[PDB]
Swiss-Prot record, chain B:
Free-text function comment from the UniProt entry: In the first step of peptide synthesis this enzyme activates phenylalanine and racemizes it to the D-isomer.
Family the entry assigns: Belongs to the ATP-dependent AMP-binding enzyme family.
Cysteine pairs bridged by disulfides in the record: none
Organism this protein belongs to: Brevibacillus parabrevis
Subunit-structure text: Large multienzyme complex of TycA, TycB and TycC.
The protein's name in its UniProt record: Tyrocidine synthase 1
Domain of life: Bacteria
UniProt domain Carrier: residue ranges: 4-78
Domain writeup: One-module-bearing peptide synthase with a C-terminal epimerization domain. Each module incorporates one amino acid into the peptide product and can be further subdivided into domains responsible for substrate adenylation, thiolation, condensation (not for the initiation module), and epimerization (optional), and N methylation (optional).
Amino acid sequence: QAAYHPPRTETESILVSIWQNVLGIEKIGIRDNFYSLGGDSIQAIQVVARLHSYQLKLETKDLLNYPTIEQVALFVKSTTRKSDQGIIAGNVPLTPIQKWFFGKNFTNTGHWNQSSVLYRPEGFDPKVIQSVMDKIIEHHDALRMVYQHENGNVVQHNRGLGGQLYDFFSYNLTAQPDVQQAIEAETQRLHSSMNLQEGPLVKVALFQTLHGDHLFLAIHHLVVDGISWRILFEDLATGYAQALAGQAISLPEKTDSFQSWSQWLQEYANEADLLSEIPYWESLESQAKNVSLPKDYEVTDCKQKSVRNMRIRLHPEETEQLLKHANQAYQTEINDLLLAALGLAFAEWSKLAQIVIHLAGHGREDIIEQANVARTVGWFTSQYPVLLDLKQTAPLSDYIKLTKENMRKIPRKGIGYDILKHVTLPENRGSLSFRVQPEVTFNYLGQFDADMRTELFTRSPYSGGNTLGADGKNNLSPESEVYTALNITGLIEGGELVLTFSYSSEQYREESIQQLSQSYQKHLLAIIAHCTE
Amino acid sequence: AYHPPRTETESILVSIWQNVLGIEKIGIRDNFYSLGGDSIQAIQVVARLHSYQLKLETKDLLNYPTIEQVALFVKSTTRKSDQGIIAGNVPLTPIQKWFFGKNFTNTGHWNQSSVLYRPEGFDPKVIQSVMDKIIEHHDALRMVYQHENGNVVQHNRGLGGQLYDFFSYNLTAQPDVQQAIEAETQRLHSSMNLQEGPLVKVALFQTLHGDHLFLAIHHLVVDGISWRILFEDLATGYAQALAGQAISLPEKTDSFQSWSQWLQEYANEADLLSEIPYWESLESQAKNVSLPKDYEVTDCKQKSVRNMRIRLHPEETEQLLKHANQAYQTEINDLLLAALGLAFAEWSKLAQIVIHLAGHGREDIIEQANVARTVGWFTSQYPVLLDLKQTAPLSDYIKLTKENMRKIPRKGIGYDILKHVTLPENRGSLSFRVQPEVTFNYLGQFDADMRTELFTRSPYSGGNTLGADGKNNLSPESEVYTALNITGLIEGGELVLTFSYSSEQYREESIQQLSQSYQKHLLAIIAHCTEK
């Protein structure tokens, strides 16, 4: 790729240290390319967040455009803005995804969560866990959110301190061999216990066993997302190591509050930068209005109890090829290759000219000058329609370049559509109808190995239905409404890309989804082989 | 915030910094200098890394002064130093040629010493096992000195001979422990045999309330860094015997023999010879400076020498070591010599003063060489010229001292090599007529080295010291080699500075004024650098 060059300045040596940490990589030179090390925009945000703790400033854009430490060190400035380090309290306007959430009027709205389980061979100290979670919920203000009704309207309120920060539970499983089902059953019960009006939105359970402890964490989706989880794992590891060393628990400086973010986004929603996007989104709505997804059984209003999860794994070799080597061929980003595979799959499996997919993005785009949310806990996730052309699948090189072209044309990684749909004043929405209702969701959460696998703890092998993706069966009420016909969710855990196809048995036969998922696997492997051959 | 280690390298470095510096919990963003670290402690970090078979250059720690940064420059050790017995000839290094060149009366009585104390008492059998392993392991301690046709020859004995002289004193039934240790250690200091005998004296003084362990070593085979390695290996050996483990000391770094040999080559290489114009420039300026003396007196002897001491209390000492260097990005010698300059400016009519500065001498001049854990006399001495005219404002004088120090090539190690080892055909017209009148010798910090789980610095160290101030180290018949000898160290969390002078050359009141001036100026420098 390029020869090892050691750092030669304070700034370079700090960037090398940050990059080694964020990526899972032991020795990085200052001419090593961020993307060739497997970097993506989430890892770029993580570098920016860590830099902030040295009072050094960088935007996500700087890193991905100048993708080596030697180049990017020029753009590194001193932070001149200090974010609010105090207690955040009071009203927080509903952000776009929060308006979508409440708009769906889900049955058991209080049971719509993300979760994970951590494992520590040496066991966890319950007094330390409680000390660290205290500091975490004090520091990450949005976790203290509650949801009230004024006049049938939802009001989001950020509590101050002094109240219930989390519910803590301890289970002694040290004298029974059914640890695995005991964690599955107890975590399912805890998932059902979220009080949106009052109680905390964070559930913490220690399971003590003969051979190590597990720490379950469940958080209502309203106050968290995938980046937020990586920050929480970081502050859990830091705080735990600080307590073990007899040091005060002390977490990095706060970035901007979810409250301030949401407030600025209310303003952004009616400013020129976003409204410039309307002609793109109108063109998209015009070109997608008729597209429709075929099903095996015509059924209305499916529930999560009807949903089944079909998983595809790429082995470590093909995963590392995808993350590190594949993008170099056509200068793509990983979403270009994953969506190229998705197109080839729908072209094979269906007779449609075109498919509209609901794409998720991290949604921490630099849309607001002097906003920094690189280390802020909250639900920032964006969702936006993408039209995949299915007609022109050959040759493979043209279909990749075409997918890349489609993705490059989208304004500001699609964050604008949901702002237009849920916040922008009606009079500023041009002729947008917002009638595009994708029936296929694609959600690549990104990489978690460096966040979850630390010196103190790791991803529990008994995570079971407690996951960060929409596939974990414990995260949602069985009575919750299905919000997409095909939910395709993926992440990198244990060195492998794991893609789950979630579907209603009441809408599709298993066979139909085995064919779609086998087609996706075959074409993604062909893209990786093509790009690396 | 405390930032914990993340990798193995970061973890070995936390552990090493905590032991070297004597700080309990160190984070990976803690600044080496802010924790009170200087270049001696950087050398001790490198020596300890070497014991883990990890390689670091001192300058990498000093330019990247946090554990997270310095870990990026830690590499696997490629080269393994000689672990076997060292034997045979060893060329005289520069300070050793200076020493023999002085032709001191009673040259066998020119020592460094220290006394350790252990409340539980010392097991004399464990002491003798540990010292056996120490003198087997630290080869230079077995050196001997002979004339071969009126020329001094230095030989590193192998094993099997006398490693050290051991003595034991039962003082458990008398109140006069303090005077008995002073009188007995003074006798033992007189007993070094340069031709054959060990150059290590070990005395156990047993008392009703704990024991004292006296160590004396002829200066020819030891220095300040060497003493710290000896304290470390004594603590390690003694802890192993207590746990009933084999006594086992870390890996050897390069022998004094090898080092002296490489030095003979470095002395006629271009890098060194390049410094000659710098050194002949310093010699030129030095010719003009004569230190005033209350009495013009010839051939003074150590028996005329009197010690006048000042101490900075712990709070001031801690500010100097940890918070003062930030102000103008200085090193500790900058602030100590700025104070010396202001002291001499106030005390004398001179426009400039020439001081002989001492340094540890373990500079990275020889790329093969690793002496980070080697026992020997490495000390460098070099002239430094202090401006006594441009003394205000204080901020300008600190910056001016720093700039003066920054123009010195390779921490002054070159001057003595040019003076004593470089072939006369390569020496330029260097006169070496620049006599030591004022010596400044800051030995550095010893609390983390001497204060251990097993033992500590004895309150009855008395005239047995690592500095030249200790009255027992030198024969009363030894010639004074410097009119004003200013020796400093950190002990008991305090900077202790001694002004040693011949009572034949100065009134006590004269040295009272200089030492009080020094104290006032250093206190003023510390308040200035930390008040702002």
